Design a binder for this molecule. Sequence first.
Ligand SMILES: *[C@@H]1O[C@H](CO)[C@@H](O[C@@H]2O[C@H](CO)[C@@H](O)[C@H](O)[C@H]2NC(C)=O)[C@H](O)[C@H]1NC(C)=O
Ligand SMILES: *[C@@H]1O[C@H](CO)[C@@H](O[C@@H]2O[C@H](CO)[C@@H](O)[C@H](O)[C@H]2NC(C)=O)[C@H](O)[C@H]1NC(C)=O
Ligand SMILES: *[C@@H]1O[C@H](CO)[C@@H](O[C@@H]2O[C@H](CO)[C@@H](O)[C@H](O)[C@H]2NC(C)=O)[C@H](O)[C@H]1NC(C)=O
Ligand SMILES: *[C@@H]1O[C@H](CO)[C@@H](O[C@@H]2O[C@H](CO)[C@@H](O)[C@H](O)[C@H]2NC(C)=O)[C@H](O)[C@H]1NC(C)=O
Ligand SMILES: *[C@@H]1O[C@H](CO)[C@@H](O)[C@H](O)[C@H]1NC(C)=O
Ligand SMILES: *[C@@H]1O[C@H](CO)[C@@H](O)[C@H](O)[C@H]1NC(C)=O
Ligand SMILES: *[C@@H]1O[C@H](CO)[C@@H](O)[C@H](O)[C@H]1NC(C)=O
Lengths: 226, 312, 74
Amino acid sequence: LIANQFNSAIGKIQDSLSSTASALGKLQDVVNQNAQALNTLVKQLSSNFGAISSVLNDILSRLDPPEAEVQIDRLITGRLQSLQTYVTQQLIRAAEIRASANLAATKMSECVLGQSKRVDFCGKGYHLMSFPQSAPHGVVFLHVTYVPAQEKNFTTAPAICHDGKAHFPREGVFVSNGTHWFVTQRNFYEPQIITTDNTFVSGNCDVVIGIVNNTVYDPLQPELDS
Amino acid sequence: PVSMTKTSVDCTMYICGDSTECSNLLLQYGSFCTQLNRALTGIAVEQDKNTQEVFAQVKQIYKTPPIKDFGGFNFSQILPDPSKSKRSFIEDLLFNKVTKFNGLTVLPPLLTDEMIAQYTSALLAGTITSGWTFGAGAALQIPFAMQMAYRFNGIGVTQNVLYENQKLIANQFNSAIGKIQDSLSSTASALGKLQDVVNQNAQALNTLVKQLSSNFGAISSVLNDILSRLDPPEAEVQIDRLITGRLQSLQTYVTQQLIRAAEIRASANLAATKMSECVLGQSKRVDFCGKGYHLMSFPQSAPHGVVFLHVT
Amino acid sequence: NVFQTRAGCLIGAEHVNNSYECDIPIGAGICASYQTQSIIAYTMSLGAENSVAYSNNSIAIPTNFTISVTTEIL
Ligand SMILES: *[C@@H]1O[C@H](CO)[C@@H](O[C@@H]2O[C@H](CO)[C@@H](O)[C@H](O)[C@H]2NC(C)=O)[C@H](O)[C@H]1NC(C)=O
Ligand SMILES: *[C@@H]1O[C@H](CO)[C@@H](O[C@@H]2O[C@H](CO)[C@@H](O)[C@H](O)[C@H]2NC(C)=O)[C@H](O)[C@H]1NC(C)=O
Ligand SMILES: *[C@@H]1O[C@H](CO)[C@@H](O[C@@H]2O[C@H](CO)[C@@H](O)[C@H](O)[C@H]2NC(C)=O)[C@H](O)[C@H]1NC(C)=O
Ligand SMILES: *[C@@H]1O[C@H](CO)[C@@H](O[C@@H]2O[C@H](CO)[C@@H](O)[C@H](O)[C@H]2NC(C)=O)[C@H](O)[C@H]1NC(C)=O
Ligand SMILES: *[C@@H]1O[C@H](CO)[C@@H](O)[C@H](O)[C@H]1NC(C)=O
Ligand SMILES: *[C@@H]1O[C@H](CO)[C@@H](O)[C@H](O)[C@H]1NC(C)=O
Ligand SMILES: *[C@@H]1O[C@H](CO)[C@@H](O)[C@H](O)[C@H]1NC(C)=O
């Protein structure tokens, strides 16, 4: 069942990606912002910046050097200001992209190369593994997560009193379907008879609020009887 | 801090407000002011994205059951007050401890303060009644005593410790919450991190507005007084000086905003990570979720930011 | 067909009492949408309000499990 669910989920990733193109919005925004900054910088060449005309050859021709110098200097100031604005925008955008690249490095090194317990670091839910996939100017993970689906109620209790001694589960939780009591692991329903090989004793009944009454079976008694 | 003030500035009405002559003359400078407007719009959208990432993490909107059976934990200071903007007591304390026409519009945030408070109250009720399963999947109810037993079992302490010292634990908890109340209401210097974001934005805007009233080397810092005194030829030289100056000032302010918004976005990413790995779970990352061994957390909203209560 | 809000005034969209997820952000809670036809503007809803039956002795424990595979671009 698990392998079939995994294959079906991979196939769903295939379908989602192959159909809807709005999934790579981040990479597309990076490319679009860069292309827009570049086209703005280029279209800034066609500005007068206050001069008589943007064409440097036109200015150099139609004015004598003594005054064409001040015209060309005005154009220089304009174009240099535009270029410096572009370089500042690129510095800031590169800081942000490097933030995302450090984040991708961390995410790959923890998610892929290992298994991270950091909640919602590796996709909503409990984490199992995650395989990377390249992408133009980026990376794409497939965070294979584990999600629980079908649950019941199972009235519970913090501990049980067997011989006046309180018994807590070593690894699990006490539940009662409505008929008897059982101790099962916390994330998957798997009831088991309350034996002393699953729980441990501590103190007595005079402390634990909400304790209940039951008998914890012992495997040593039948082995002694037989 | 999570978000800034969604400020927007109109290049034209700032630089050459109400002058077709100055507007036409500025038009010769190219796409400068369109560039500026697009940058400030990017910031303005990123603020709403920040708030979304931080708070809008829960799928549904959980709501605590009125029968407050929490093994002794009071929780009444952080759960919403149905008798106010339905916020909690400590959200209110955080509120009240935090304190022009040149195209300086100020867009409103997309998530109002009451919707923010509803989000953090959903997160809080989900935490209280279901531990971490609501962030891991579907919310599974579980008694708070058993939940804190799990958390105690997380840091290498057997459950019987809690199950025996429950009353002492609840007393220490509630006393600490009360201490938080007292501290926040008395020494209001605790919210410096948010108040300084607000002060930095206010001072940037004040410098930007002051710069309007400087000559930059022209004869009169009033565009209209220049227009109504000089010919087109000389007025063009004067207006050119003024435009150059004001545009350099506006570009400086927008670069400052871009840098500061990058810093705030770093802090909002950190707050999102902190909520995901701290509230919605229990992180074994030392000193990342409170100085000490970590038990849980409870988010509480604030003006332009978030505030946690790292129960360690 | 005017409708004043906290972010401006929206010309050409009717105010609806309902509340669906935000479709086109507007400001200060309002969120436009296009539904049959006309354009509606309402106050966005944060999600299905879902209480939980929390007792002091009741629990919930999963029996089945799905293996989902999400995708995270960077
Ligand atoms: C579990 O069973 C024990 C004995 O079988 C109960 O112990 C007595 O319970 C009565 C009634 O509450 C008390 O008056 C006595 O003082 C208890 N002790 C003795 C030595 O008789 C115990 O109460 C039961 N617990 C539950 C939850 O049913
Ligand atoms: C949780 O704490 C609040 C605050 O102390 C308690 O409400 C107070 O109750 C006392 C007496 O019951 C009053 O004198 C105060 O005026 C109350 N304060 C407020 C702000 O209402 C509340 O009782 C506590 N909850 C529980 C379950 O004990
Ligand atoms: C463990 O520490 C707690 C808290 O410091 C102690 O509990 C307090 O003890 C003093 C004096 O014994 C009482 O006045 C208080 O009412 C107690 N409760 C609180 C909340 O302060 C406890 O005595 C210490 N020792 C143990 C539990 O063995
Ligand atoms: C867990 O969930 C799976 C998925 O729904 C259940 O398996 C399905 O059972 C129905 C019953 O006819 C089939 O039609 C589906 O094709 C099955 N799907 C898969 C993926 O196996 C399964 O019964 C559930 N319970 C358990 C214990 O696995
Ligand atoms: C049992 O759990 C379900 C959740 O699936 C809940 O709706 C129901 O109210 C619970 N039972 C009782 C008696 O509350
Ligand atoms: C738990 O809830 C039940 C139902 O209201 C109540 O009778 C009981 O006193 C509570 N406490 C314990 C420890 O069971
Ligand atoms: C929406 O609510 C307003 C009052 O808030 C009411 O006047 C109006 O009739 C309602 N319209 C619809 C379509 O429900």
